[PDB]
Swiss-Prot record, chains A, B:
GO biological process: angiogenesis; cellular response to glucose starvation; ERK1 and ERK2 cascade; establishment of Golgi localization; Golgi reassembly; lung development; negative regulation of apoptotic process; negative regulation of innate immune response
Organism: Homo sapiens (Human)
The organism's taxonomic lineage, starting at the top: Eukaryota, Metazoa, Chordata, Craniata, Vertebrata
PTM-bearing positions, type N6-acetyllysine: K2, K67
Main location: cytoplasm
Quaternary data: Interacts with CDK16 and BSPRY. Interacts with WEE1 (C-terminal). Interacts with SAMSN1. Interacts with MLF1 (phosphorylated form); the interaction retains it in the cytoplasm. Interacts with Thr-phosphorylated ITGB2. Interacts with BCL2L11. Homodimer. Heterodimerizes with YWHAE. Interacts with FOXO4, NOXA1, SSH1 and ARHGEF2. Interacts with Pseudomonas aeruginosa exoS (unphosphorylated form). Interacts with BAX; the interaction occurs in the cytoplasm. (Microbial infection) Interacts with Epstein-Barr virus protein BPLF1 and TRIM25; leading to inhibition of the type-I IFN response.
Record protein name field: 14-3-3 protein zeta/delta
PTM note: The delta, brain-specific form differs from the zeta form in being phosphorylated. Phosphorylation on Ser-181 by MAPK8; promotes dissociation of BAX and translocation of BAX to mitochondria.
Positions bearing Phosphoserine: A57, S181, S204, S207
Gene that encodes the chain: YWHAZ
Pfam families in the record: 14-3-3
């Protein structure tokens, strides 16, 4: 049952068998009860590890398929298509769970934001390997989910809330990588980052560890996207 | 065919999909032709990654099953038994390939030593999780394979040969971990290590990188097995 599957998943996770962990939490979700915060995390972790495995493998084999003979074309296509199928299966599972169980059962504006972000992410993972007619609609589906989550969080969370900030991060990545719109991508991330700094007081010890990491990630992305970020060497003489 | 499967495995390996890599090389072996030195390595790598995954997972779940409730006993046993089954399947595959294809086809005393070491290893991996009646015979099968390899290498290789030294390493581990005979384990490793130093001239640039690593591993094990190894602080004043 619920408690057995969760303790099962905690074993799976400790043992780094994330496919087992995802299988556990898939079943948990399908009981139809709203996940806990522990259980939200467990599911979330499980599936990032699973899809992530496929996504890194895909990029390796794509880059090899780029970096090439016709013998070596034949092999790499047939393999990337294999990995692509695995990957889409994984994404379609999560996207299903989100549609049927997670987003409908989300009773708090936070949990809803997390699950809309998750949809946005998994549609973006599809967009990474989407081709032809399908890309159009899949990019919409990601943006549609991210934008829904974005506007909810804008109303519901403090600028320094790790979920809001994490959302801004992945949304700016969608805009940058998937949509190829850096004007938009950098403004999204910068405005979030600025707004968080403007309300550092509103940060509690509770989430000081996590908010300051996501801010560094936002800033990291930003300087990367804007060439060298306009940077020059600085001392504790920066302000006037 | 052979060349397609090998280039297939090189993709699999680059993409860290070692189950695919093992599957590739399993088929290669089963063509019935003696593997190359490239192909020996590919198979060997593929399966260490595969069994290694299971072995680390096993030890994690065993230690959790130790560190515990009866609820938590029920879950951990049923899971360790799952992993144990996976693991034995993997070992039985390799052990089969070694028996039917690799050791029979080994035409050079080196390749034979490598494949006898490999048998010794995979029987030792079984010994790690063996229980009851079976352990007896499985420990014999490991020692029988290691000893065969040992005596061949003693005649056929220089004391500084990485294969001889690597064999001494894993044999001393069998004696230590699986057999629980440290007198024997430390003498095996020390005598190998001493004998290599005694003939450092016989070391070529070809294998200088690898022989000096295995020697450090032998020595590492040795100081660990003999308490603190009799060590005190030393300077370039050590010799007389």
């Amino acid at each position: 049952d619920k408690n057995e599957l969760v303790q099962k998943a905690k074993l799976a996770e400790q043992a780094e068998r994330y496919d087992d962990m995802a299988a556990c939490m898939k079943s948990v979700t399908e009981q139809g009860a709203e996940l806990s915060n522990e259980e939200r995390n467990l599911l979330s972790v499980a599936y990032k590890n699973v899809v992530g495995a496929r996504r890194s493998a895909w990029r390796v084999v794509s880059s090899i398929e780029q970096k090439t003979a016709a013998a070596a074309q034949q092999m790499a296509r047939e393999y990337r298509e294999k990995i692509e199928t695995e990957l889409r299966d994984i994404c379609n599972d999560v996207l299903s769970l989100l549609e049927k169980f997670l987003i409908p059962n989300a009773s708090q504006a936070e949990s809803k934001v997390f699950y809309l972000k998750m949809k946005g992410d998994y549609y973006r993972y599809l967009a990474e390997v989407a081709a032809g007619d399908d890309k159009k609609g899949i990019v919409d589906q990601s943006q549609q989910a991210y934008q829904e989550a974005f506007e909810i969080s804008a109303a519901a969370m403090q600028p320094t809330h790790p979920i809001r900030l994490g959302l801004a991060l992945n949304f700016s990545v969608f805009y940058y990588e998937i949509l190829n719109s850096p004007e938009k991508a950098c403004s999204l991330a910068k405005t979030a980052f600025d707004e968080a700094i403007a309300e550092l007081d509103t940060l509690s010890e509770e989430s000081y560890k996590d908010s300051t990491l996501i801010m560094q990630l936002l800033r990291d992305n930003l300087t990367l996207w804007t060439g060298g970020g306009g940077l020059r060497t600085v001392s504790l003489g920066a302000g006037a």
